């Protein structure tokens, strides 16, 4: 329930990583989503390569498996002057040992001591047993690979549901009973809208008939619903008496009455140019 201005982020030229998957970073302001999740952290530099789908590594496997079908953007920037301290900043903890890799977006905060060997540890570190989390020497004199980097991941969720976050764009007027290019809540298409007597339950937004195309749709500004009919189409069939006999012609438009298109209306369509 808040507008996302991705231009401020994308055009900032301060973030050291702009990795968008499934969505182009320049169209983040043009599409919109039902929800977006933000995860903000500080990670080393040789390791920001591990924050992306389908990768391996201690953070990629033992910290956060990102699924191969990600739709989101990975954003990171330097924090040498904001995170590091002279004496070493050890407030961020990381595990090197786990029993198995974490699930997609799985969070484990368990402080159990891992058994590297045969007999149990019983909550004490030690001989084939280590406390899971180790500290990092974030220092302002460290090399780039070991410097701290602040990472934010933005997973945009795109389902067939109301969109609560939408980018910077201008909503226009509504016109009815005419062939338009329409965009309702991110649903783009072309057709003619008509008032509909259907009733929508308070959770119900869209409507379908037999196929993926949405028959009806709801209005965001006003609590109203209008159905959608495709703009008129038909085959133009041409009648002729033979150019040998004459150059006159007649045209037939299949399956329409003669409103949208010497006029003869037939059950096959409107006939134009031929007398009755």
């Amino acid at each position: 329930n808040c507008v996302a201005d991705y231009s401020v982020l994308y055009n900032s030229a301060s973030f050291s990583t702009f990795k968008c998957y499934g969505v182009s970073p320049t169209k983040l302001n043009d599409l919109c989503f039902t929800n977006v999740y933000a995860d903000s952290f500080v990670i080393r530099g040789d390791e920001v390569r591990q924050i992306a789908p389908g990768q391996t590594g201690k953070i990629a496997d033992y910290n956060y498996k990102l699924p191969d079908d990600f739709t989101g953007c990975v954003i990171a920037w330097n924090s040498n002057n904001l995170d590091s301290k002279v004496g070493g900043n050890y407030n961020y903890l990381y595990r090197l040992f786990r029993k198995s890799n974490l699930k997609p977006f799985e969070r484990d905060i368990s402080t159990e001591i891992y058994q590297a060997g045969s007999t149990p540890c019983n909550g004490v570190e030690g001989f084939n047993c280590y406390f899971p989390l180790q500290s990092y020497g974030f220092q302002p004199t460290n090399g780039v690979g070991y410097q701290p980097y602040r990472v934010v991941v933005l997973s945009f969720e795109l389902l067939h549901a109301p969109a609560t976050v939408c980018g910077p764009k201008k909503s226009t007027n509504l016109v009815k009973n005419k062939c338009v290019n329409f965009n309702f809540n991110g649903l783009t298409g072309t057709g003619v809208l008509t008032e509909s007597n259907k009733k929508f339950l308070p959770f119900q937004q869209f409507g379908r008939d037999i196929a993926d195309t949405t028959d009806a749709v709801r209005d965001p500004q006003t609590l109203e619903i209008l159905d959608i009919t495709p703009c008129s189409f038909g085959g133009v069939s041409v009648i002729t008496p033979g150019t040998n006999t004459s150059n006159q012609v007649a045209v037939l438009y299949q399956g329409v009455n003669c409103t949208e298109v010497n006029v003869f209306q037939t059950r096959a369509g409107c006939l134009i140019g031929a007398e009755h």
Partner: nanobody, 127 residues
Framework: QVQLQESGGGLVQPGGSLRLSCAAS????????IGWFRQAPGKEREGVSC????????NYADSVKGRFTISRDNTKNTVYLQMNSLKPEDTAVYYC????????????????????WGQGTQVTVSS
């Protein structure tokens, strides 16, 4: 499978010349803007030179005006950096980075995110 690979590093005499290469595999380098970046021992990674995707815009660091020349071959998917009148102040590891303009305006003088990076090559200037 996107890779950026530097080449041409080595040891040269001050006042001599050296020429680096950056080649791209797994993707077409022509659409990206490429910049050459170096870090000296004990120093931060500074921008040496940059060139536009089409090559019509370039920028260099004031320490290297009149000495370094950047260019690219979009048919061969490479970007080149020629170094002349080389000095001990230039002893550093040189990276080539490829990225897209994150601001309005043609010039590449501003810095921004750098999408892809190489592993770097070493050029040492000592005599």
């Amino acid at each position: 499978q996107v890779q950026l690979q530097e080449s041409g590093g080595g040891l040269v005499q001050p006042g001599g010349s050296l020429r680096l290469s950056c080649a791209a595999s797994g993707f077409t380098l022509d659409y990206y803007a490429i910049g050459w970046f170096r870090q000296a021992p004990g120093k931060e990674r500074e921008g040496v030179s940059c060139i536009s995707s089409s090559g019509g815009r370039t920028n260099y660091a004031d320490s290297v005006k009149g000495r370094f020349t950047i260019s690219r071959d979009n048919t061969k998917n490479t970007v080149y950096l020629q170094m002349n009148s080389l000095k001990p102040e230039d002893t550093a590891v040189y990276y080539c980075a490829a990225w897209e303009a994150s601001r309005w305006y043609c010039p590449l003088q501003f810095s921004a995110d750098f999408s892809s990076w190489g592993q770097g090559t070493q050029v040492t200037v000592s005599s």
